[PDB]
Motif scaffolding. Sequence first.
Motif, mmCIF file in Angstrom:
data_model
loop_
_atom_site.group_PDB
_atom_site.id
_atom_site.type_symbol
_atom_site.label_atom_id
_atom_site.label_comp_id
_atom_site.label_asym_id
_atom_site.label_seq_id
_atom_site.Cartn_x
_atom_site.Cartn_y
_atom_site.Cartn_z
ATOM 1 N N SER A 1 -7.386 2.840 2.341
ATOM 2 C CA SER A 1 -6.599 2.179 1.310
ATOM 3 C C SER A 1 -7.459 1.450 0.287
ATOM 4 O O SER A 1 -6.927 0.979 -0.723
ATOM 5 N N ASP B 1 0.857 -1.175 0.000
ATOM 6 C CA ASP B 1 0.000 0.000 0.000
ATOM 7 C C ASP B 1 0.896 1.229 0.000
ATOM 8 O O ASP B 1 2.099 1.138 0.261
ATOM 9 N N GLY B 2 0.302 2.373 -0.317
ATOM 10 C CA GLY B 2 1.043 3.620 -0.335
ATOM 11 C C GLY B 2 2.165 3.660 -1.346
ATOM 12 O O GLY B 2 3.185 4.320 -1.110
HETATM 13 MG MG LIG Z 1 -3.722 2.781 -0.170
#
Ligand SMILES: [Mg+2]
Lengths: 524, 524, 524
Positions: B150, B86-87
């Motif tokens: 997310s 994620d990110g």
């Molecule tokens: Mg995310």
Amino acid sequence: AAKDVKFGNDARVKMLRGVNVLADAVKVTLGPKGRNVVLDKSFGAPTITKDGVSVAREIELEDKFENMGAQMVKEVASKANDAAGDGTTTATVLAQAIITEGLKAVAAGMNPMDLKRGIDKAVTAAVEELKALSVPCSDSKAIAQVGTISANSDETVGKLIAEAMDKVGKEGVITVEDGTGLQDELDVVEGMQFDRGYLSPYFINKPETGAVELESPFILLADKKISNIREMLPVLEAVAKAGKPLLIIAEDVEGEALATLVVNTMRGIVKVAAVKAPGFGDRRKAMLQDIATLTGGTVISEEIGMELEKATLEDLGQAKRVVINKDTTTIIDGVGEEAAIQGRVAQIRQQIEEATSDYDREKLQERVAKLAGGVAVIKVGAATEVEMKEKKARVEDALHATRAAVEEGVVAGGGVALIRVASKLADLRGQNEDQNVGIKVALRAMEAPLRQIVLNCGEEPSVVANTVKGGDGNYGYNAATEEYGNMIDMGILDPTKVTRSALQYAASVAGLMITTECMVTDLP
Amino acid sequence: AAKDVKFGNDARVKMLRGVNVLADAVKVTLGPKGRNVVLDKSFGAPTITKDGVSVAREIELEDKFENMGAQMVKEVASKANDAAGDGTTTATVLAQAIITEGLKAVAAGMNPMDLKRGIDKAVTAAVEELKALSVPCSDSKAIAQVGTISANSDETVGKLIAEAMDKVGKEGVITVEDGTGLQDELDVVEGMQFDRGYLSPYFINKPETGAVELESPFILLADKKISNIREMLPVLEAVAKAGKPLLIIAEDVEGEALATLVVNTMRGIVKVAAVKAPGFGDRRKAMLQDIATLTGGTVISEEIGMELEKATLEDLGQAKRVVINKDTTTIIDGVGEEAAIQGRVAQIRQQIEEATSDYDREKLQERVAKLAGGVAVIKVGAATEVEMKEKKARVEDALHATRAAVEEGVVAGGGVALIRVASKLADLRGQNEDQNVGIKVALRAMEAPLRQIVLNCGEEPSVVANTVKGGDGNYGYNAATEEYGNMIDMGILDPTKVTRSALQYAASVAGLMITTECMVTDLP
Amino acid sequence: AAKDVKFGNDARVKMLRGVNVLADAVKVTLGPKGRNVVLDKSFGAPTITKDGVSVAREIELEDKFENMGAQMVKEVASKANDAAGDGTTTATVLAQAIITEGLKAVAAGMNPMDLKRGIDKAVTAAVEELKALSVPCSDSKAIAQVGTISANSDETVGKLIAEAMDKVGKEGVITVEDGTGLQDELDVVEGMQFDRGYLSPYFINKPETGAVELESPFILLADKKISNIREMLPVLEAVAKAGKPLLIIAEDVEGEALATLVVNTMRGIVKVAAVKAPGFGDRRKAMLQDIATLTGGTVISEEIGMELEKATLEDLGQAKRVVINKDTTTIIDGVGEEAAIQGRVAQIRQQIEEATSDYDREKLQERVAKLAGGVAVIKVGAATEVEMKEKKARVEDALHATRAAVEEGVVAGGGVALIRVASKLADLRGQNEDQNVGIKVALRAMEAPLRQIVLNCGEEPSVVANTVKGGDGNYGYNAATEEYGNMIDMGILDPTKVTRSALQYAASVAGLMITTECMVTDLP
Ligand SMILES: [Mg+2]
Ligand SMILES: Nc1ncnc2c1ncn2[C@@H]1O[C@H](COP(=O)(O)OP(=O)(O)OP(=O)(O)O)[C@@H](O)[C@H]1O
Ligand SMILES: Nc1ncnc2c1ncn2[C@@H]1O[C@H](COP(=O)(O)OP(=O)(O)OP(=O)(O)O)[C@@H](O)[C@H]1O
Ligand SMILES: Nc1ncnc2c1ncn2[C@@H]1O[C@H](COP(=O)(O)OP(=O)(O)OP(=O)(O)O)[C@@H](O)[C@H]1O
Ligand SMILES: [K+]
Ligand SMILES: [K+]
Ligand SMILES: [K+]
Ligand SMILES: [Mg+2]
Ligand SMILES: [Mg+2]
């Protein structure tokens, strides 16, 4: 096919162009303030390097003449890396300078052969002066400093490398590899540790590790395939009566014999760990006799005249501790004669001296390191992978420099000892004024390394090199610090082997590079 | 082949062009108001995604230097997804910002390697500040909020994720998969349910389901091929006397004994269900030992030194209920020692820690999940398929972020905790003013994620980011709401692991990215 | 490879261009006055079609981005045909209208994902209104009307279809094929008829047809190969003593056994008809068990514990009549327990319920239809081959619509019920004005089907649709008659399933079609 030939000055122009291209690509990574060269890779991600021969070996030109001139000049960096593994950029810079000055002398209308003769004379004298200017580097401080300098001023790398040869000893083996995290580390291994895991997990006496451990083990060194318990009835009955653990180092143990042995392990009869004999064939017998020498046992072989059914406790090598895991069998303190250990490593070192392949001498040297000393491994860590490659390359350059500095010593670093040597040879004259001009070519070329190192720092290589020449000995230019002073003192240390090999190869290439008159390629 | 070699500012320009193209493609999907990108597929219909590394991994340029520069910068998103899942867009944005600012610093005619040193220093400090700013995310509420953020502001996803770990436990396994209807679904499975259907339909005691069910079954754990009933006369006589169902988890049952057993089933002699041992080889032995632990039985093997004809009721594992269908055999509440299960999963976790491949550690983690806790499965629903892909990708991104938030906690989301951390480091100075400028490169680039998140919402990243910086802590910008306030409170939760890994990889790439001097690629 | 990337409104324009091209090609076949399209065949003569998804699936664009959008919009027609098999042009038109209006909304600078959220909200409400507006179509009249409208105003087709399910029953199978002459034909088959002709012509009791017929036959259900009369001595002696004709449904009867049986047939001993067991393997056993249930017999197989030499009159299934010809063996009124018939078909319908492939559920439903109900066939007759194709496709569209109308009912035809549904949703508002505009996009697009149907008829879709909207309920426009009035009464019926699936898939595609920002495709 019809060929493409250049005569006279045109061939020399192509040669100078190719050499200049290759050396310009190489030299941007020289010195502590040298920069990195990003190399595209057709497969995967591009690499980032600061190594000299690494940049040199990637250079080819579309112009055939310039390309093959670059091919001939790449030999300088290639051979410099081959000999010492460091200072390849210095070799390339020196070779380019010698070639340029000698070609200029040829452009004056005078004999290139005498130029080569004078260049060889002057460079031989210069290599002698470098060797005489060598100051020993065997203390882990100076060794760490040398590695630092060749790790692009990285004290941690040289320190870890000095600690590595400290842990492993001189006869041990030092290896640099990657670690999993962001940080480097060092591990040293002593005694025997050969990657022969237990041939059955039922032998495992410590399932929390999935490993077998035997104490005062009986090492049956069988240069044979162990098949039937009928072969092991006398020896295994003798061991069960002895009750002490027996370790199998043989070609293998069969499934039925393994079943009998594993059953007996939790039947309590014999605590046996069955593993294989390290090596394959001649090296298998080498490892077998190695373990026999360490453990005071005898390798069960058939052409020599005994059988496994003839094997008893005496044929069983004896150790203190042998830890077997899923992969490695570590004979810790093989209870046996050290005298056969030194005799074995002596025959092994005789083989090394008679080993022409670096592989052969290295395998035998590792046989010594296991049998006599230890084995040390350096893991290196980085967050990303281009950082991994660059840092590992720097650490291995540091390794090469550290070992070469242990070998021949060091001199004033940063291309300064070469300036001193060139000052030591300003008088040399060859057979004719042509050879004297060749000597002057070599002398003029000898001050290139410091000047290029300083130029990578952005100073005036003219003024800086002049100030360096104003002092002498180890007085130089701390290129990273942008100061003058004793290059030995602040730890700017280069192995004398590195510089000597670099200079030798540069001159040897340039000598025939100057004397080119007819040059032939193929038609484009 | 003849290479295409670049030096000086041209190399940096090509690097920056490729990196900017890649990051511009990536960052349109950042934030709660990030937009989707259609990726054309030569085979099938083109796909729609809002994932960052997914967009990053599809970017290549015709310009060789720009293309390979994009190749090195893609590593940031790839590694951010590898570590955190994620990110990744935040990682790409941070990497591009650091690269651009450091290249601008180099353009001032100043040292790039000290810029890299300062960047690494400042980013290490920033990772420390992020980790110290981590606030735990273990409650199902904060897990749901992390999944929301997310999954592109999708509360249902994070809610289902928190419910998933609630149902399966923490040592259990959660999987996001495809559902048949229009909606997502979550299912948890306890005990072992292994996909070994009955070897014969005549064992079926419930033909309405076409399945076999055994109560208080005798689990014959035989890691051997059943070859004749004569092997089972002891156990089958013992079970017919016992009368309780016998369940076969063996290597297999041959057709002749299968016919005998099926006949006995409607002859009423022994209630038989023949299935196979899950796994193959070593994993088969692992599954068999797991079933033996839960069922209090023993795996029938020959190396240990006993035969199937030697087996009795005790060697038959015992369960409470075993349901066999055409596919799966569910040992429900195997009546047997739990302590052996926990010791087994302890050795399993030892393997996990010694499992380098994610596959190995994941298989062993699932062994723990079946043996200790349960197994959870998340389904996803959609009407068409592009919706299915986008929603499932969002759900799995949310799963990754929820797990990373359980691991390291959360921080102020939406590029706000990074602003706080950058404000925490405005003082750091490196070895020289060059390293100080590198630290300032890192600090200036740290605030980019809020700017990109806000810009994807269409506000003034300047004015909005200024107002965000006006407050501190979790005060920031609710980008979806287009308001200011507490990031933690408004459900804007991002894992600290995600941001830390993103920053680490971005800076680790940018450090060598700044020190680029030369490019070498093939000629076009 | 080097990619071709489109950002922003260029991507939206390319998407809209591809969608518009596909929908323009599709919608010319919509309504009773849809016009046909010649689709070139590189092999053979081109076809003439009025089907929507058939035209949609042939759309390919050289522009990678327009072709990308066209591939994403083809999913609407593909999925509409997949679900209901009808009203695919309506799906394409609705999807194009929603996509165009949402792209117009995004072109106003407003949030696309909220537009998608509003579109999904509005379309969910609209599908609910369609389901609530469903009026049942179960009698043969409304079925004929639905077929007629979906056979492009062809009463004969819907009439024949209603007659087909009348003859075959609801559990039976209706199949549409082509006929040989110039007229369609409907045939219904009841009971057992499996294509297993007599194994030898000497069994033929009627050379005028080359067929075998047995009265009160003994059906030997041998799930085994029948080889030597020594296996059948008890069976054939029992049959000859019983004197009844013996029908063999097994894997086969061997040549010596067949020769003996055929000899006995004109020797007057046993009137045997040897045929094979329908199906292969598991399906062969399934057919054998179906025949056992129908005829009150037992399937002879070894694994249960009986042999062919153990078979007698009881294991011989019993029927009333079995007609065997060169191809088929029709067990007409197998005299046996009906209860096992319904239990078996119940298990088969269970298998349908966990049947994933449509082939699986089709096989099982045919097993039920043979064993419980009947089997129907519809032919298609005409003078030429393009007429074969067009008439058959039209009849099968009518079949799909009739079945879907039996399933969910019907609504007002000609895009009029959709107008009523949109009038029922003129108020829906989402989370923000963005979702509200998405809802209004859906509402504005909802009136496209009637307008396009009328345009295919050459009227003013503006004025005509306005007059339709002026009335309500079933008041619409008779597109074929060019008149307004009730859709239900005058025979304009469409399934609620067809329209519901069309709308659902249109919205599901358009939702992500609107929110896209960027494209990635290969370079041309
Ligand atoms: Mg995310
Ligand atoms: N701090 C320093 N001050 C002065 N000179 C230095 C300093 N560090 C290194 N040098 C000099 O610069 C060179 C080191 O540069 P670098 O390690 O990149 O290349 P190299 O050793 O010539 O070759 P290689 O690429 O084979 O490792 C050596 O000539 C060394 O003497
Ligand atoms: N409602 C919100 N308010 C404020 N910031 C938000 C909100 N929702 C998400 N964010 C922030 O925007 C980003 C979420 O964007 P997105 O989930 O598309 O990508 P990502 O988390 O960076 O990466 P990945 O593509 O790997 O999932 C995060 O930085 C998150 O902190
Ligand atoms: N006489 C009619 N009056 C009004 N509307 C009609 C009439 N006949 C057909 N329609 C309408 O036109 C459509 C039927 O035409 P057609 O069968 O060519 O298209 P379709 O059902 O969309 O496509 P397909 O069968 O290929 O999936 C339906 O929307 C139906 O309501
Ligand atoms: K170098
Ligand atoms: K993203
Ligand atoms: K149509
Ligand atoms: Mg060096
Ligand atoms: Mg139709």
